[PDB]
Specification:
The structure is cut from a larger assembly and holds two copies of chain A (49 residues). In chain A, the strands form two sheets. Chain A has a two-stranded antiparallel sheet. A two-stranded antiparallel sheet of chain A has the order 2-3. Helix content of chain A is 0%, strand content 16%. By secondary structure, chain A is mostly beta strands. Chain A is built from no helices and four strands. The radius of gyration of chain A is 13 Å and the shape is flat. Chains A and B meet through loops of A and loops of B. Chain A: This is Spike protein S1. The PDB classes it as viral protein/immune system.
């Protein structure tokens, strides 16, 4: 049925520094339009499973 | 438009392509990019589209 408890991050502003860690969960903003914490086009949740 | 069983095929060629007017037009219900994320299209060059 699928183990959906193992997630990974697929969007970030900038690549990590070595051994750096980032557990935030802010709504990513691809396009120029601001997101205001809601999903939509060019406003994506940053974690996939 | 064209049927689904005889789709069309236009071979875009040498020009200046601006995928931003596409990406941000907000009129599209689905805009998925596979080989390459959408925002980096206006920064690459290919042979044929």
């Amino acid at each position: 049925g699928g183990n959906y408890n193992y997630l990974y991050r697929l969007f970030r502003k900038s690549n990590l520094k070595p051994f750096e860690r980032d557990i935030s969960t802010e709504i990513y903003q691809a396009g120029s339009t601001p997101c205001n914490g809601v999903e939509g086009f060019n406003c994506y949740f940053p974690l996939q499973s | 438009f064209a049927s689904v069983y005889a789709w069309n095929r236009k071979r875009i060629s040498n020009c200046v392509a601006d995928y931003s007017v596409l990406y941000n037009s907000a009129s599209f219900s689905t805009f998925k990019c596979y080989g390459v994320s959408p925002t980096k299209l206006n920064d690459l060059c290919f042979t044929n589209v």
